[PDB]
């Protein structure tokens, strides 16, 4: 459903249970939930998200992502 190149937002409930929560901090930064990250290079079940903050991009699951219209 989630294409390559549309604005997505991260859901907090499906993120802090899985394997993607071990790499990061538990206190999640607020730029994930403001829906502005452009998803590029979907690879199977996972997706790289270019968030508007000048930090490295993250790879999250496509189940952990909600489209921000």
């Amino acid at each position: 459903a989630i294409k390559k190149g549309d604005l997505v937002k991260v859901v907090a409930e499906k993120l802090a249970n899985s394997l993607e929560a071990l790499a990061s901090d538990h206190r999640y930064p607020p730029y994930l939930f403001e829906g502005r990250g452009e998803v590029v290079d979907i690879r199977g079940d996972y997706a790289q998200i270019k968030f508007p903050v000048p930090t490295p991009t993250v790879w999250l699951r496509l189940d952990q992502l909600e489209v921000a219209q």
């Binding site: 270019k50 968030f51 508007p52 903050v53 000048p54």
Partner: protein, 148 residues
């Protein structure tokens, strides 16, 4: 010479658009924007290559596009017009402001003359464009410097 008075402030009220010729090792230009700042004139030292079109920067608002750096959209930051935003914050009990442009020697003559004819059409505002170099710091109006 060495003991400088306040003739630099009186020449700026006369001409309105000066053109300093300072020593290129610096340190001797700024002693004349202290005599300028002692007489109530505030000072906005800007950089002459950093300005774009001086009409669209000084008296008009300009859309400054910041570095999106590949992780941001094309934002347009509309900054206020520089000489007429620093005039309104300047209180009316003090005198005007001066534009202390440094590295004026990379400005074209069309941008020299635009800074010359603006200081009289805009009240309580002057410019000092630091252009060129000389062994002794000296000034002249911008009206005949473009006539050189």
């Amino acid at each position: 010479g060495l003991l400088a008075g306040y003739q630099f402030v009186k020449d700026l009220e006369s001409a309105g658009a000066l053109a300093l010729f300072v020593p290129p090792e610096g340190g001797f230009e700024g002693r004349y924007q202290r005599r300028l700042r002692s007489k109530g004139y505030t000072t906005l030292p800007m950089s002459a290559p950093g300005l774009g079109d001086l009409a669209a920067y000084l008296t008009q608002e300009h859309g400054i596009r910041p570095a999106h750096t590949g992780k941001e959209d094309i934002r347009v930051y509309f900054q206020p017009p520089l000489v007429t935003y620093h005039l309104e914050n300047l209180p009316p009990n003090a005198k005007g402001l001066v534009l202390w442009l440094i590295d004026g020697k990379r400005l074209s003559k069309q941008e020299f003359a635009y800074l010359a004819q603006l200081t009289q059409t805009l009240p309580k505002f002057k410019v000092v464009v630091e252009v060129g170099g000389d062994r002794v710091v000296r000034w002249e109006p911008l009206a005949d410097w473009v006539a050189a």
